[PDB]
């Protein structure tokens, strides 16, 4: 006995338009922003640790560790200038999530990304759990000050190669991303404890589910809740080495998990098409892209 009448994208679409599916949680990772030109900052193929010789770090990872950053922030900000995107244009996937919001289906979007594209696409603070923080805002690091600065201010400092200092107290100003050694956001744990009591559908897009504790969110869904993965590669299955709550797409025991393998944009397009939303999504994307291109 299962909520999906078949373990396919078509089964998921029929379930979404049934009275049983009211509340959708999206879990998204780097795979939803690669088509916007944003690289996967956790992939070794990105080479974040490769050309740091001129910074004389005690070890490669120090560039992203909070205690090192606070005393030697220049390497991080030099790297941030080199990797700073040329444009912030959200993808079809981001705008699919905006449509979910528009239609009253979006309970929450948990994101591993720091690129701000969920916000640009129209998800509001209350819709989002930025599990690793964001570049959208930055804060003075002094506990007694904590002056907030917008991304436009931070970008100007990064591009002029001036280490960002607080105008009120002259302390370092840090983008609101979670550095290694920093606490994960309290909001991540608070929202998880409430949201997963309420979820009817998990949409997992563009994440290989390899980074904890984000990956463990799939095990927080009720046992009946269908879980759709839209991703270039299958992910989330229990590790035959390591291994509880893993994806089961393909066994005779499979009952609720569905994998659609391909580009995230094409998967969301296909799902929107099944839902009758394709024209709405095309119109939204073309309009928002036109607006961003015209800034």
């Amino acid at each position: 006995e299962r909520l999906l009448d078949e373990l396919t994208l078509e089964g998921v679409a029929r379930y979404m338009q049934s009275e049983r599916c009211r509340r959708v949680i999206c879990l998204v990772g780097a795979g939803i922003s690669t088509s916007a030109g944003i690289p996967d900052f956790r992939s070794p193929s990105t080479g974040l640790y490769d050309n740091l010789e001129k910074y004389h770090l005690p070890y490669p990872e120090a560039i992203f560790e909070i205690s090192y950053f606070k005393k030697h922030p220049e390497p991080f900000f030099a790297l941030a200038k080199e990797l700073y995107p040329g444009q912030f244009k959200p993808t079809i996937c981001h705008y699919f999530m905006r449509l979910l919001k528009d239609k009253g289906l979006l309970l929450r979007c948990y994101t591993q990304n720091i690129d701000t594209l969920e916000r640009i696409a129209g998800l509001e603070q209350e819709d989002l759990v930025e599990a690793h923080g964001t570049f959208y805002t930055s804060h003075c690091v002094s506990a007694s000050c904590r002056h907030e600065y917008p991304l436009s201010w931070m970008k100007e400092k990064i591009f002029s190669e001036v280490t960002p200092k607080c105008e009120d107290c002259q302390s370092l100003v840090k983008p609101d991303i979670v550095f290694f050694g920093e606490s994960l956001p309290a909001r991540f744990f608070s929202c998880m404890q409430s949201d997963f009591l309420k979820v009817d559908l998990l949409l997992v897009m563009g994440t290989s589910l390899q980074v904890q504790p984000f990956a463990s969110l799939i095990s927080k869904a009720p046992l009946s809740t269908p879980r759709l993965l839209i991703n270039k590669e299958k992910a989330g299955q229990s590790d035959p080495f390591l291994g509880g709550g893993g994806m089961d797409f393909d066994s005779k025991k499979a009952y609720r998990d569905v994998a659609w393998l391909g580009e995230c944009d094409q998967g969301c397009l296909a799902l929107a098409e099944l839902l009758g939303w394709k024209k709405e999504l095309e119109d939204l994307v073309r309009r928002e892209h036109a607006s961003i291109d015209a800034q």
């Binding site: 690793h132 290694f180 050694g181 994960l184 504790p213």
Partner: peptide, 7 residues
């Protein structure tokens, strides 16, 4: 609160 690590 749990701190951010490699894993």
């Amino acid at each position: 609160l749990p701190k951010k690590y490699g894993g």
